[PDB]
C-alpha cells in the first residue's frame, strides 16, 4: 500500500535502518520510518567521487 | 556539517556515502498501487486445475 519512488544520498550504514519498526539514527529524522513504513533498497557505489 | 561529507578510508568504518534508491510503502487508507506479476503460470486447459 502507498507505493512511492524515493531516493536518498546517505551513509552506507544508515541505508539498512529503513526496516519497519526501526528508528534510524539519521534516516528516521530526515524521513520518518515508523512501523507502518515498508519498502526495498537499491544501492549504488557513489564513493568514486 | 563541517565534516559530514568526504569519507576518509583512514578513519571511520561503515559511514561510506552511497547513492541509494529506496522504495517507500505506507499503511495509509489510500488504495494500493503495486501487485507483483508472480511470474504467472502456463495456461492448462481441458483438465481439472
Amino acid at each position: 500500500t502507498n507505493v512511492y519512488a524515493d531516493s536518498f544520498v546517505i551513509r552506507g550504514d544508515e541505508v539498512r535502518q529503513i526496516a519497519p519498526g526501526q528508528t534510524g539514527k539519521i534516516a528516521d529524522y530526515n524521513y520518518k520510518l515508523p512501523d507502518d513504513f515498508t519498502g526495498c533498497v537499491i544501492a549504488w557505489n557513489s564513493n568514486n567521487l | 556539517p563541517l565534516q559530514s561529507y568526504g569519507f576518509q578510508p583512514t578513519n571511520g568504518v561503515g559511514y561510506q556515502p552511497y547513492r541509494v534508491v529506496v522504495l517507500s510503502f505506507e499503511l495509509l487508507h489510500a488504495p494500493a498501487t503495486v501487485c507483483g506479476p508472480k511470474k504467472s503460470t502456463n495456461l492448462v486447459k481441458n483438465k481439472c486445475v
Partner: nanobody
Amino acid sequence: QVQLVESGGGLVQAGGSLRLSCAVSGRTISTFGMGWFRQAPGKEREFVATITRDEDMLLYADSVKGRFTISRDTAKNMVFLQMNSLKIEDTALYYCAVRRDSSWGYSRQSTEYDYWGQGTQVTVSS
C-alpha cells in the same frame, strides 16, 4: 578483546572445500537475518553471500558470484555456508552476521554488518 568463533580456521588447502558456521549464541545471525561477511586484511569489509527464504534464488556477491553455495534444511534451523574453489586471496577473517543497531532484512551490501569483535582467522595458501 573477545573474538567470534566460527567453524574452520587455520591453514586451508587451496582449491578445497570448507564449511562456515557460527558458534556463538549470544547474538545469533537469525535475529539480525542469516548472512555472512568477511573482513579482508586491514580495515576492508565485504559481503560473500546469503540464503533467502524462497530458496529459488540466492543473493550472490559479485566478488564471489557463482562460487559459494549454501545448503538448506527444513528442520535443521541453521544455515551453513560452503566454499568452492578457494584461492589465496580468500585469506580473511570471517564474521557472523551482526548489526550494531536493531534491524531485520535481507541485503547484498558490503557495509551490511560490522562489529568490533574480531572473527575467526582463516589462512588460505598453495
